[PDB]
Every structure is written in C-alpha cells, then in structure tokens.
Specification:
The structure is cut from a larger assembly and holds two copies of chain A.
Chain A: no helix or strand
C-alpha cells in the first residue's frame, strides 16, 4: 500500500522535542506558540485527557 | 514580572500592546491641593470663603 494505509514513517521532522524551558522560549506542543515565560507549577485539576486549558 | 496569578488581564493587555498610561499628576498632590483649599475655607485667612469664618 504505497502512500496509503496506516503504518506511516515518522522520519520527517519529528516535533516531540523534550526540552526544559524556564526562559522566554516558545513551546513545541498543543496550540500555536506565542510568547511565554514558563512558570512550572504543581496542579491536580488535570485529569482524563486534559493537557491544555483556555480562559 | 514573574510569579503567580496567571489570570492577570491588565498586563496581558500591556503585553498585547494597549497601555493605560498614568496621569501626569499624582492623586497625592491633588488630594493635598483639595485639603489645602478646604482648610483655607476653614481657617483664617478664608480665601476660599471670601474672608469669612465658616460658622
């Protein structure tokens, strides 16, 4: 199944780049990367499949 | 400038561009001016009371 099916190569640019951030560097995850300083905090209110929240 | 209160609408207004400039006169000196006018009305010489005692 050339260029079809389900089993697809991830040998393009993989964006899963686990880089620690505590300076003004944009992220690489859900949502469009705007300006942000990363304040690492502990929370419990995330559950199920809830990574992001809006106001 | 860093820390807590991620719901901070006044500075994300400033981060988006709109800045509420402070007025060019502080309220301390304006309140002192109003106090000075009131005690001028209450004490001799009564400049704010046309030279007449309050009672």
């Amino acid at each position: 199944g050339i260029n079809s099916g389900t089993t697809c190569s991830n040998d393009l640019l993989q964006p899963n780049t686990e880089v620690f951030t505590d300076v003004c560097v944009d992220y690489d995850l859900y949502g469009i990367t705007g300006q942000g300083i990363f304040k690492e905090v502990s929370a419990v209110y995330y559950n199920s499949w809830q990574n992001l929240l809006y106001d | 400038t860093g820390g807590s209160e991620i719901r901070d609408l006044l500075c994300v207004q400033s981060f988006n561009g709109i800045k509420v400039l402070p007025p060019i006169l502080s309220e301390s000196q304006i309140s002192g001016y109003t106090t000075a006018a009131t005690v001028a009305a209450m004490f001799p010489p009564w400049s704010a009371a046309a030279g007449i005692p309050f009672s």
